[PDB]
Amino acid sequence: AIELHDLKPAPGAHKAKTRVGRGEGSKGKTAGRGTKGTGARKNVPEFF
Amino acid sequence: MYAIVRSGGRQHKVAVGDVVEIDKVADEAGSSIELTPLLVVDGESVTSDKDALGKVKVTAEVLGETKGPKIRILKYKNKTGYKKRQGHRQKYTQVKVTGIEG
Amino acid sequence: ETKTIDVLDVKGKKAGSAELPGDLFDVNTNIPLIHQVVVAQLAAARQGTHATKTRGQVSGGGKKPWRQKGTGRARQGSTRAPQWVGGGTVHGPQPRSYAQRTPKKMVGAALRGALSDMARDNRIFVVTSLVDGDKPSTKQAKAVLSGLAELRKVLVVLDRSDEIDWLSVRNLSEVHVLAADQLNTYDVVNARTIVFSQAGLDAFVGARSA
Amino acid sequence: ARVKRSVNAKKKRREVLDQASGYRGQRSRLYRKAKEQTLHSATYSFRDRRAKKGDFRSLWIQRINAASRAQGMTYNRFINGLKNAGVEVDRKMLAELAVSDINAFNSLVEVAKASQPQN
Amino acid sequence: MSKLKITQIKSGIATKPNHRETLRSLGLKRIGDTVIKEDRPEFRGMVRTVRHLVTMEE
RNA sequence: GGGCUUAAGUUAUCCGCCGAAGCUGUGGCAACCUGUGUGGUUGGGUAGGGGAGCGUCGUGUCAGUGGUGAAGCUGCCGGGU
Ligand SMILES: [Mg+2]
Ligand SMILES: [Mg+2]
Ligand SMILES: [Mg+2]
Ligand SMILES: [Mg+2]
Ligand SMILES: [Mg+2]
Ligand SMILES: [Mg+2]
Ligand SMILES: [Mg+2]
Ligand SMILES: [Mg+2]
Ligand SMILES: [Mg+2]
Ligand SMILES: [Mg+2]
Ligand SMILES: [Mg+2]
Ligand SMILES: [Mg+2]
Ligand SMILES: [Mg+2]
Ligand SMILES: [Mg+2]
Ligand SMILES: [Mg+2]
Ligand SMILES: [Mg+2]
Ligand SMILES: [Mg+2]
Ligand SMILES: [Mg+2]
Ligand SMILES: [Mg+2]
Ligand SMILES: [Mg+2]
Ligand SMILES: [Mg+2]
Ligand SMILES: [Mg+2]
Ligand SMILES: [Mg+2]
Numbered sequence: 001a002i003e004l005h006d007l008k009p010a011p012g013a014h015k016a017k018t019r020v021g022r023g024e025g026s027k028g029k030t031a032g033r034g035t036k037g038t039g040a041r042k043n044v045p046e047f048f
Numbered sequence: 049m050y051a052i053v054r055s056g057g058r059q060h061k062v063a064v065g066d067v068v069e070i071d072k073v074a075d076e077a078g079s080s081i082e083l084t085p086l087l088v089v090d091g092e093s094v095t096s097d098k099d100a101l102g103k104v105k106v107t108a109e110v111l112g113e114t115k116g117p118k119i120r121i122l123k124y125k126n127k128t129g130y131k132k133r134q135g136h137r138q139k140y141t142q143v144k145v146t147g148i149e150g
Numbered sequence: 151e152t153k154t155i156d157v158l159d160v161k162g163k164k165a166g167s168a169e170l171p172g173d174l175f176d177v178n179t180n181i182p183l184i185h186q187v188v189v190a191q192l193a194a195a196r197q198g199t200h201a202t203k204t205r206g207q208v209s210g211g212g213k214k215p216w217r218q219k220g221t222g223r224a225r226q227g228s229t230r231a232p233q234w235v236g237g238g239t240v241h242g243p244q245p246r247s248y249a250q251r252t253p254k255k256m257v258g259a260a261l262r263g264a265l266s267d268m269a270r271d272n273r274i275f276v277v278t279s280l281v282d283g284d285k286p287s288t289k290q291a292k293a294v295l296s297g298l299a300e301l302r303k304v305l306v307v308l309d310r311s312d313e314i315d316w317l318s319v320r321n322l323s324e325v326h327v328l329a330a331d332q333l334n335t336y337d338v339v340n341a342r343t344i345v346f347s348q349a350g351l352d353a354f355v356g357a358r359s360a
Numbered sequence: 361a362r363v364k365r366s367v368n369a370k371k372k373r374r375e376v377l378d379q380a381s382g383y384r385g386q387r388s389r390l391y392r393k394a395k396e397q398t399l400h401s402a403t404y405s406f407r408d409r410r411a412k413k414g415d416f417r418s419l420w421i422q423r424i425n426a427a428s429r430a431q432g433m434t435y436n437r438f439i440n441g442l443k444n445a446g447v448e449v450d451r452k453m454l455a456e457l458a459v460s461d462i463n464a465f466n467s468l469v470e471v472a473k474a475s476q477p478q479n
Numbered sequence: 480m481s482k483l484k485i486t487q488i489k490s491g492i493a494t495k496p497n498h499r500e501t502l503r504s505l506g507l508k509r510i511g512d513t514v515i516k517e518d519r520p521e522f523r524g525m526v527r528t529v530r531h532l533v534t535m536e537e
Numbered sequence: 538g539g540g541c542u543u544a545a546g547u548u549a550u551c552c553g554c555c556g557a558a559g560c561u562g563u564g565g566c567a568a569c570c571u572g573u574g575u576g577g578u579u580g581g582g583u584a585g586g587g588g589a590g591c592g593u594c595g596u597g598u599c600a601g602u603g604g605u606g607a608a609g610c611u612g613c614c615g616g617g618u
Contacts, residue, residue: 004598007185024129057563094467122402436554
């Protein structure tokens with residue numbers, strides 16, 4: 001007699017997706033990359 | 049007849065029948081509290097010394113809990129992206145002075 | 151717990167008896183497990199035919215709108231750039247499948263727990279059949295209302311020629327009809343009671359039993 | 361699931377335009393310009409709620425100074441006299457006494473005079 | 480043993496990390512904070528190390 | 538800056554006071570530690586790391602609700618960190 005509205009996930013099983021670049025109260029603006037440089041825009045290869 | 053009394057680290061000039069905005073205290077509404085007096089003036093007669101102020105009792109009763117104005121804090125600094133929002137209400141307690149008995 | 155219990159076949163009034171095997175119809179109801187299985191079920195049910203045109207797929211926009219310098223306008227590379235009205239969508243939806251590869255043991259166990267919860271709550275009835283001879287919806291509406299309430303599941307299993315019961319209960323709109331080989335956790339949880347046909351319960355037990 | 365921004369977006373704009381409902385020029389009409397002034401308004405209000413203590417203490421001290429100098433006693437000697445006499449009536453009640461009950465304030469002045477070190 | 484009484488009169492800001500760690504070891508945490516220590520040479524040493532930040536008594 | 542040597546200048550010394558979001562008093566909030574009756578410590582903050590949430594749209598389920606007026610828009614009176 002659970003009924004579909006009593007089904008909930010275990011606590012901690014569904015971590016909230018972090019949404020970046022959506023204000024300065026979170027990972028905002030630079031989006032966790034800092035300022036300028038290669039890493040500001042793409043990446044650096046692991047073999048480099 | 050009036051008394052300079054203290055309550056919660058803040059002083060008031062009270063008289064019998066006055067309503068005073070006291071810092072929140074644990075005593076429940078309708079009960080009675082004693083406000084510590086720091087001065088008594090009965091008209092050209094000023095009781096000021098500790099020994100005599102010990103004998104005088106300012107008695108008052110609790111009316112209810114009232115809230116202060118809603119305060120909106122927005123801490124901000126330019127060119128950093130920093131902001132911090134906050135609010136405050138600062139509940140107090142109504143008091144009615146019922147008597148200043150020497 | 152693995153207790154096998156006994157329910158009584160009805161056919162409206164009374165008939166023989168049927169056994170709930172216990173190893174299924176009496177197991178734990180892992181709510182998180184059931185939730186995951188049901189969510190995966192609905193995700194598989196999703197169709198996901200949604201699409202947008204990127205800046206490369208929007209018509210036109212091949213040439214630079216104007217010179218890079220000298221005009222006093224911002225540097226633009228195409229009229230279909232995402233910041234333009236009528237330009238491409240950057241990270242809009244694309245067609246995809248939402249099906250999740252839930253393990254067999256998880257899916258089955260969830261089904262067992264969902265069945266077991268209302269087996270312990272006494273919401274499974276077994277009937278020899280509904281309707282006799284030719285097939286109406288009035289008859290079975292009665293058989294089920296005599297059973298209890300109107301948020302129902304029916305099992306008739308007989309996938310090829312149980313047209314009588316299937317077509318009788320097909321049009322109730324508060325009855326969900328299934329073959330025993332398609333019980334599935336979503337429908338079991340959604341059901342407030344299950345009524346098995348004798349053959350339906352027998353075939354489900356035969357398909358899965360220890 | 362395309363989402364249109366307007367219904368959610370207008371809420372902060374209405375809040376800020378309400379908060380800026382006495383400002384001059386663009387500061388009370390335009391959300392962006394009102395937003396800049398509300399930052400300054402919040403900073404000023406926070407700073408002034410803490411400077412208010414000092415402002416009112418200064419006002420009380422000036423009034424006490426005037427009232428005691430009317431009795432031939434400077435503020436510093438008056439406060440030292442009260443401290444030595446052990447009367448812990450504060451700058452606020454003292455200023456209210458000076459404005460309202462000048463006779464009680466003068467009696468306190470006499471108390472301070474008597475409690476002076478006389479040295 | 481005379482139970483030294485040490486109180487902090489100046490802040491630790493801009494002082495040397497030596498001095499700040501000495502204050503922490505003495506247990507002083509704010510200006511005006513007071514601690515009681517035994518008349519032990521280590522505590523006399525801490526007091527003389529931060530002598531410009533604290534006052535001592537008996 | 539006004540003005541100041543009739544110091545309101547320099548200097549030695551003594552007695553007071555002013556003075557910060559420091560300290561203390563009082564009231565509220567929060568993080569952490571601790572034996573878990575207490576209490577202790579802490580809470581400026583950019584890049585950035587961690588944690589917990591608000592609001593919008595779609596949607597399963599249950600409970601509903603709506604021309605005796607939904608959505609949206611717009612006043613007033615309130616509420617929350
Ligand atoms: Mg930032
Ligand atoms: Mg920005
Ligand atoms: Mg990073
Ligand atoms: Mg950058
Ligand atoms: Mg940049
Ligand atoms: Mg750089
Ligand atoms: Mg970098
Ligand atoms: Mg790296
Ligand atoms: Mg590569
Ligand atoms: Mg900067
Ligand atoms: Mg192209
Ligand atoms: Mg231009
Ligand atoms: Mg190009
Ligand atoms: Mg288009
Ligand atoms: Mg003056
Ligand atoms: Mg202060
Ligand atoms: Mg402080
Ligand atoms: Mg304090
Ligand atoms: Mg912080
Ligand atoms: Mg701090
Ligand atoms: Mg940061
Ligand atoms: Mg209706
Ligand atoms: Mg809508």
